[PDB]
Ligand binder design. Structure first.
Ligand code: NA
Ligand code: NA
Lengths: 11, 28, 250
């Protein structure tokens, strides 16, 4: 449902 | 903060949003 | 938000989205109170009846947003949490008394046209403005009806309700740390928070100094926009000594 966010915020 | 609650696109420009007047009118 | 409208750009620059990392989803609203502190409802983070007990690493906060689902490149900012603080007397067992929590960000967020903190009330602003009939404003990305989801942030203005009317609308025990808001059945106009809006702010624009103050936190309700029911909000001023203690100590 949500656009993927930059991977840097999930590290 | 000293600048809290003053919105860049509204109060800081002296522009009102479309419904803030409704709030003001209720403060009787 | 039920029976609201699309927010204007920059209308609520303190609005924060609490975002679950995995699965990626909206958890709650929240508000920016300084460059490193975010205010929300305790029940957004801790609610044992629903097996909810998030840790810092489970969540992100997204600040400066308008679109619900889009990644708003060059506009929104995404912050990790350093530490969650729940009010020590938050009553999740019964009635959500003292439904308040703070989140400290790992790094300060840069303010912009879209990102700016709301004020917290002083005793006098609270005494003046927390009166039945006076309207505040609730914003969020929650559902558009009880039983669907908005493209962009929604806004609704709602009147504070007399305490006896709030009490007589529900079987839940109300406390002085809560207030309720919404239109009465005979008032015609409608509107409420709904699922996904909780934790977000109930704000009022002081007519004395033309600043926005966060008087409430979207806390609980029984349905969304039901006739004869009202939304309940955490009374921020009543809990401000705890907010200050946390910020001063940490
Ligand atoms: Na009652
Ligand atoms: Na209602």
């Amino acid at each position: 449902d949500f656009e993927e966010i930059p991977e840097e915020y999930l590290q | 903060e000293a600048d809290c609650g003053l919105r860049p696109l509204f109060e800081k420009k002296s522009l009102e949003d479309k419904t803030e007047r409704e709030l003001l009118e209720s403060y009787i | 938000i039920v029976e609201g409208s699309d927010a204007e750009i920059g209308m609520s620059p303190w609005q924060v989205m609490l975002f679950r990392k995995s699965p990626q989803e909206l958890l709650c609203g929240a508000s920016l109170i300084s460059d490193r502190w975010v205010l929300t409802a305790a029940h957004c983070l801790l609610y044992p009846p629903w097996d909810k007990n998030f840790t810092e690493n489970d969540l992100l906060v997204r600040i400066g947003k308008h679109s619900r689902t889009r990644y708003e490149r060059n506009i929104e900012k995404i912050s990790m949490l350093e530490k969650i603080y729940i009010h020590p007397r938050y009553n999740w067992r019964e009635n959500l008394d003292r439904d308040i929590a703070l989140m400290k960000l790992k790094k300060p967020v840069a303010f912009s046209d879209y990102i700016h903190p709301v004020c917290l009330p002083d005793r006098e602003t609270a005494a003046s403005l927390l009166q039945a009939g006076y309207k505040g404003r609730v914003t969020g990305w929650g559902n558009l009806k009880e039983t669907g989801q908005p493209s962009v942030l929604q806004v609704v203005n709602l009147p504070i309700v007399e305490r006896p009317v709030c009490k007589d609308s529900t079987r839940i025990r109300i406390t002085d740390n809560m207030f309720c808001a919404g239109y009465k059945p005979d008032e015609g106009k409608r509107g409420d928070a709904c699922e996904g809006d909780s934790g977000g702010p109930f704000v009022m624009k002081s007519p004395f100094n033309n600043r926005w103050y966060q008087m409430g936190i979207v806390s609980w309700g029984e349905g969304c926009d039901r006739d004869g029911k009202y939304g309940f909000y955490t009374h921020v001023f009543r809990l401000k000594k705890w907010i200050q203690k946390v910020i001063d100590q940490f």
